[PDB]
Amino acid sequence: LEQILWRVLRGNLFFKTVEIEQPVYDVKTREYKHKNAFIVFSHGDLIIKR
């Protein structure tokens, strides 16, 4: 996801990855996997929508 973000949004966009202590079950995957936070900040409404 980070590589895709830095490619499509070639400009500068900060990231705030934070690790989750325990896995959370997924609906389609039917399994609990370790997750991380996807906090991201950028300017421009169109950029936010993208």
Partner: protein
């Protein structure tokens, strides 16, 4: 601290941009005030004409 500081700086830059927008809005308000001042200047001649109309 670099990433958290960067996020805080991004929020601060957003706040500064909002402050710039507010300054632009205040400039628009000042433009309206200049329009009102021009209205007062016109009203000065309006009072002068009213005196002249009463002068006749």
């Amino acid at each position: 601290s670099q990433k958290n500081g960067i996020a805080t700086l991004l929020q601060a830059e957003k706040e500064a941009h909002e402050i710039v927008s507010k300054a632009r809005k205040y400039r628009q308000d000042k433009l309206k005030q200049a329009k009102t001042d021009a209205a007062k200047e016109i009203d000065s001649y309006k009072i002068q004409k009213d005196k002249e109309l009463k002068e006749f």
